[PDB]
Amino acid sequence: ADERFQALLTNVNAVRAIADAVEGTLGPKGLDVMLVDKFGEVTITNDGVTILDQMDVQHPAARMLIQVARAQEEEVGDGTTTATVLAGALVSEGVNQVEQGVPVSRVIEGLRRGVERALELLRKQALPVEGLDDPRLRAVARIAAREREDIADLVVEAARHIGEDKLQDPNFKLADTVTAREGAENQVITVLVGAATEEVVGERERVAKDAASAVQAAIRGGVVPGGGAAELAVAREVEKLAEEVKGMERYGVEAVAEALKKPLRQIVANAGFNPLEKLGDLRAAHRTGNDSLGIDCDTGEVVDMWEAGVIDPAPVKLHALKAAGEVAAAILRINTIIKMK
Amino acid sequence: ADERFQALLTNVNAVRAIADAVEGTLGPKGLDVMLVDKFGEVTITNDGVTILDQMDVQHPAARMLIQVARAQEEEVGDGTTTATVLAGALVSEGVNQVEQGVPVSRVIEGLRRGVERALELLRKQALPVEGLDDPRLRAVARIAAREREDIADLVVEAARHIGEDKLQDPNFKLADTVTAREGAENQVITVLVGAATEEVVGERERVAKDAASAVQAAIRGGVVPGGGAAELAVAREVEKLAEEVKGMERYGVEAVAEALKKPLRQIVANAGFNPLEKLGDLRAAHRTGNDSLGIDCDTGEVVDMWEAGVIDPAPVKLHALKAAGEVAAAILRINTIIKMK
Amino acid sequence: ADERFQALLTNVNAVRAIADAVEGTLGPKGLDVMLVDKFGEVTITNDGVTILDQMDVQHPAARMLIQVARAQEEEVGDGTTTATVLAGALVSEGVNQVEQGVPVSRVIEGLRRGVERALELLRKQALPVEGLDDPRLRAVARIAAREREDIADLVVEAARHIGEDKLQDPNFKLADTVTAREGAENQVITVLVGAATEEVVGERERVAKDAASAVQAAIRGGVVPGGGAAELAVAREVEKLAEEVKGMERYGVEAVAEALKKPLRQIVANAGFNPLEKLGDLRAAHRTGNDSLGIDCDTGEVVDMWEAGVIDPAPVKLHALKAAGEVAAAILRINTIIKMK
Amino acid sequence: ADERFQALLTNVNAVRAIADAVEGTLGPKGLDVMLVDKFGEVTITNDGVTILDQMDVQHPAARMLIQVARAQEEEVGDGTTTATVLAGALVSEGVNQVEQGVPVSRVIEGLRRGVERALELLRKQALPVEGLDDPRLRAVARIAAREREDIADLVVEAARHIGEDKLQDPNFKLADTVTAREGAENQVITVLVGAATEEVVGERERVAKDAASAVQAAIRGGVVPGGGAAELAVAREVEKLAEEVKGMERYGVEAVAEALKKPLRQIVANAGFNPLEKLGDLRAAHRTGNDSLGIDCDTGEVVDMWEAGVIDPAPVKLHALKAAGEVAAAILRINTIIKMK
Size of interface B-C (CB pairs under 8 A): 75
Alpha carbon of C86: minimum distance to chain B alpha carbons (Å) = 19
Identity of the amino acid at A148: R
Residue D339: which of A66, A41, A19, A64 has the closest Cα? A41
Contacts of B246 in chain C (CB under 8 A): 299
3-state secondary structure of A304: strand
Q: What does the alpha-carbon distance between residue A35 and residue A41 come to, in Å, rounded to a whole number?
A: 8
HSE (side-chain half, CA atoms, 13 Å) at A332: 32
In chain B, what's the furthest Cα-to-Cα distance? 65
For residues D90 and D96, what is the distance between their CA atoms, to the nearest angstrom? 10
Q: 3-state DSSP call for residue B77?
A: coil
- Bridging pattern class, strands D337-339 and A33-36: parallel
Report residue C130: phi and psi, to 5°: -95, 105
Q: Which residues of C76-96 are buried (b: 16+ CB within 10 A; e: fewer)?
A: bbbbbbbbbbbbbbbbbbbbe
Chains B and C touch (3+ CB pairs under 8 A): yes
Residues 6+ apart with CB under 8 A from D228: D261, D263, D264, D265, D267, D294, D295
Show Cβ contacts of residue A288 under 8 Å, excluding neighbours closer than 6 positions: none
Residue C40 C-alpha from the chain's centroid: 31
CA distances from B46 to A310, B26, B27, B31, B149 (A): 61, 9, 10, 7, 18
CB of C292 within 8 A of CB of C280? no
Contact C141, C214 (CB under 8 A): yes
| Residues D105 and A271 sit within 8 Å (Cβ to Cβ) | yes
In a mutational test of the D interface, the residue from C105, C236, C250 whose CB has the highest number of chain D CBs within 10 Å is C250
Q: Residue A172 contacts by C-beta under 8 Å, 6 or more apart in sequence? A: A166
Question: Rounded to whole angstroms, how far apart are CA atoms D97 and D94?
Answer: 5
The shortest C-alpha distance from D111 to chain A (Å) reads 14
Neighbours of chain A (3+ CB pairs under 8 A): B, D
**Backbone φ/ψ region at D155: left (φ over 0), alpha (ψ -120 to 50), beta:** alpha
Q: How far apart are CA A87 and CA A105, in angstroms?
A: 17
- Give, in order, the Cα–Cα distances in Å from B118 to each of A97, B260, C3, C294, C298: 27, 9, 60, 34, 21
Q: Do B287 and A244 touch (CB under 8 A)?
A: yes
Which chains have 3 or more CB–CB distances shorter than 8 Å to chain C? B, D
Q: Do D336 and A272 touch (CB under 8 A)?
A: no
Half-sphere exposure at residue A303, Cβ-oriented, CA atoms within 13 angstroms? 15
Which amino acid, B245?
A: V
Contact by Cβ (8 Å): B214, B140: yes
**C-beta separation of A155 from A205 below 8 A:** no
Contacts with C240 (C-beta within 8 Å, 6 or more apart), sequence order: none
| Alpha-carbon span B139 to B263, nearest angstrom | 20
The contacts of residue D214 (CB under 8 Å, 6+ apart) are D78, D140, D141, D143, D144, D155, D313, D316
CA distance D214 to chain A (A): 27
CA distance B153 to D283: 92
The neighbouring-strand residues paired with B44 are B34
d(CA A106, CA A248): 6
Q: What's the distance, Cα to Cα, between the start and end of chain D in Å? A: 25
Contacts of A235 (CB under 8 A, 6+ apart): A118, A256, A257, A258, A260, A261
Beta bridge partners of B193: B180
Maximum Cα interatomic distance, chain D, rounded to a whole number of Å:
65
A chain contacts of residue B102, beta-carbon cutoff 8 Å: 276
Cα angle value C81/C82/C85 (rounded, 5°): 85
Q: Does D338 sit within 8 Å of A55, measured CB to CB?
A: yes
A contacts of D105 (beta carbons < 8 Å): 29, 31, 270-272
Return the residue of B nearest to C301 by Cα.
B247
How far does A298 lie from chain D, in Å, by closest CA?
A: 9
Query: What residues in D contact C281, CB-CB < 8 Å?
Result: 246-247
| A182 three-state secondary structure | strand
Q: In this complex, which chains have at least 3 CB pairs below 8 Å with chain D?
A: A, C
Calpha distance D313→D320 (Å, rounded) = 11
C199: Cβ contacts below 8 Å, ≥ 6 apart:
none
Alpha-carbon distance D294 to D308, whole Å?
Answer: 9
Between chains, do C287 and D101 touch, taking CB under 8 Å as contact? no
Residues 6+ apart with CB under 8 A from D121: D233, D234, D237, D238
DSSP state of B81: H
Residue of D nearest to A52 (CA): D340
Question: Do residues A89 and A258 touch, judged by C-beta distance below 8 A?
Answer: yes
Reference C87, options C332, C264, C336; nearest CA is: C332
Helix ranges (H only) for chain D are 2-20, 48-54, 60-76, 80-100, 104-125, 136-144, 149-162, 201-221, 229-244, 250-259, 262-270, 275-285, 305-308, 314-332
DSSP string, D40-76: -----B--HHHHHHHS---SHHHHHHHHHHHHHHHHH
Distance of CA D209 to the CA centre of its chain: 16
CB contact under 8 A, D105 and A54: no
Q: What are the phi and psi torsion angles at C192 (to 5°)?
A: -90, 115
Enumerate the β-bridge partners of residue B295.
B302
For chain B, what is the radius of gyration of the CA atoms? Answer: 20
Query: What's the number of CA atoms in the CB half-sphere (13 Å) around residue C169?
Result: 9
Whole-angstrom Cα distance, residue A242 to residue A253?
A: 5
- How many Å lie between the alpha carbon of B5 and the closest alpha carbon of chain A? 19
Please write down the HEC assignment for all residues of D152-193: HHHHHHHHHHHCCHHHHCCCCCCHHHEEECCCCCCEECCEEE
- Nearest-Cα distance to chain B for C216, in Å, is 30
Sheet harboring A178-182: ordered strands across?
A178-182, A191-195, A187-188
Report d(CA B93, CA B254) in Å as an integer: 9
The residue of A16, A25, A34, A273 whose CB has the most chain D CBs within 10 angstroms, and thus the best one to mutate to test that interface, is A34
The secondary structure of residue B193, as a DSSP letter, is E
C-beta separation of B50 from B36 below 8 A: no
What residues does A305 pair with on adjacent strands?
A: none
D and C interact (at least 3 Cβ pairs within 8 A): yes
CA distance A211 to B23: 59
Q: What is the DSSP string of C5-20?
A: HHHHHHHHHHHHHHHH
Do D247 and C284 lie within an 8 Å CB cutoff?
Answer: no
Strand order in the sheet with B191-195: B178-182, B191-195, B187-188
CB environment C142-157: b (16+ within 10 A), e (fewer) = bbbbeeeeebbebbbe
Q: Mutating which of B99, B246, B258, B279 best tests the A interface, going by the most A Cβ atoms within 10 A? A: B246
Q: For the sheet containing B337-339, what is the strand order? A: B337-339, C33-36, C42-45
Signed CA dihedral, C209, C211, C214, C220: sign only: negative
- CB contact at 8 A, D325 and D115: yes
Task: Name the 3-class secondary structure at D7.
Answer: helix
b/e D182-198 (16+ beta carbons within 10 angstroms → b) = eeeeeeeeebbbbbeee
Question: Closest residue of B to C268, CA-based?
Answer: B105
Distance CA A166, CA B213 (A): 82
For D281, the closest of C247, C251, C274 (CB atoms) is C247
3-state class (DSSP) for residue B71: helix
Question: Among the residues of chain A, which ranges form H helices?
Answer: 2-22, 48-54, 60-76, 80-100, 104-125, 136-144, 149-162, 201-221, 229-244, 250-259, 262-271, 275-284, 305-308, 314-333
List phi, psi (to 5°) of C225.
Answer: -60, 115
Q: Give burial (CB, 10 Å; 0-12/13-18/19+) of C14.
A: buried
What distances in angstroms separate CA C311 from CA A140, C77, C319, D103, one per listed residue? 51, 17, 16, 34
Cβ distance of C248 and D100 shorter than 8 Å? no
Rounded-to-10 torsion of CA D318, D319, D320, D321: 60
DSSP annotation string for B225-250 = ETTTHHHHHHHHHHHHHHTTS-GGGH
Distant-in-sequence, close-in-space partners of A211: CB < 8 Å, separation ≥ 6? A141, A144, A145, A151, A152, A155
To the nearest whole Å, the CA of C80 is away from the closest chain D CA by 28
End-to-end CA distance of chain B: 25
Distance of CA A30 to the CA centre of its chain: 13
Which 8-state DSSP code applies to residue D127? B
Indicate the residue of C244, C247, C287 with minimum beta-carbon distance to D277.
Answer: C247
Q: Are B233 and B225 in contact (CB under 8 A)?
A: yes
| Phi, psi (rounded to 5 degrees) for B223 | -130, 160
Give Cα B142 distance to the centre of its chain: 17
How far apart CA D31 and CA D34 sit, in angstroms, is 10
Query: Minimal CA–CA distance to D257: which of D278, D243, D275, D276?
Result: D243
Tell me the pairing of strands D187-188 and D178-180.
unpaired
d(C-alpha D18, C-alpha B318), whole Å? 68
Signed CA dihedral, B68, B70, B75, B76: sign only: positive
Neighbours of C160 (CB within 10 A): 15
Q: Could you tell me which residues come within 8 angstroms of residue C318 by beta carbon, excluding any fewer than 6 positions away?
A: C119, C122, C123, C126, C221
The chain C residue lying nearest B104, using CA atoms, is C272
Residues C132 and C156 sit within 8 Å (Cβ to Cβ): yes
